[PDB]
């Protein structure tokens, strides 16, 4: 099985600086890039960086160019995030996931508290359904992004899960009542049956250009009484 276990998450003062670990298992940690996501509180996910297989290049976001540095070590097969001049806005849980564009694995996530690109739209923001009901959400590009779409599952507390790539293509273990479809700037995920595990919140991310965007997402929850 393939196991992501972070690290080095607590509070810190601001301008302050932490060093986040992840310790990889499971594949061969060498063979891919590997990425840090991040969502801050009440929000949605934001790539932050990516570092590539052998350490030769990396990525930053905008947000945090010049302050993280993002490492390896593929003998202790570790991924590292040095955070410096920390700030308010980076507050977030720091999740740590494997390759650049389908982040088809992901870590348990360690939280940080500190004392010109595609835009992605989902509707609706949030909707109330119940068990058998057809469930439909709707992501929207500001420009053709092919088929390179994604879509993740977070349940509650829990990280985020891949559920389809490439628009329409069914990750393994992915029950059928869940499809997508679309291209070039509407996309559409559907789940034709709701099931009590189905209750969690969707997002759409688009690779065809970096840096990776997610939407903000969608929460589906169960009907109030």
């Known amino acids: 099985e393939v196991q992501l276990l972070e690290s080095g998450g607590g509070l810190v003062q601001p301008g302050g600086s932490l060093r986040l670990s992840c310790a990889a298992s499971?594949?061969?940690?060498?063979?891919?890039?590997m990425s840090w996501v991040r969502q801050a509180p009440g929000k949605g996910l934001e790539w932050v960086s990516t570092?590539?297989?052998?350490?030769?290049?990396?990525l930053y976001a905008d947000s945090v160019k010049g302050r993280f540095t993002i490492s390896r070590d593929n003998s202790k097969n570790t991924l590292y995030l040095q955070m410096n001049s920390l700030r308010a806005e980076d507050t977030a849980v720091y999740y740590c996931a494997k390759n650049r564009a389908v982040f088809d694995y992901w870590g348990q996530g360690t939280l940080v508290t500190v004392s010109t690109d595609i835009q992605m739209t989902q509707s609706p923001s949030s909707l109330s359904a119940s068990v058998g009901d057809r469930v439909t959400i709707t992501c929207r590009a500001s420009?053709?992004?092919?088929?390179?779409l994604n879509w993740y599952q977070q349940k509650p507390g829990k990280a985020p899960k891949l559920l389809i790539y490439?628009?329409?293509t069914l990750q393994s273990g992915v029950p059928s009542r869940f499809s997508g479809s679309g291209s070039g700037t509407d996309f559409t995920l559907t789940i034709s049956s709701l099931q009590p595990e189905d209750f969690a919140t969707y997002y759409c991310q688009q690779y065809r250009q970096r840096p990776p965007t997610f939407g903000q997402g969608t929460k589906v929850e169960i009907k109030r009484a």
């Open positions: 490439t628009a329409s």
């Open positions: 570092i590539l297989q052998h350490g030769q290049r990396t």
């Open positions: 420009q053709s992004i092919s088929s390179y």
């Open positions: 499971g594949f061969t940690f060498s063979s891919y890039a």
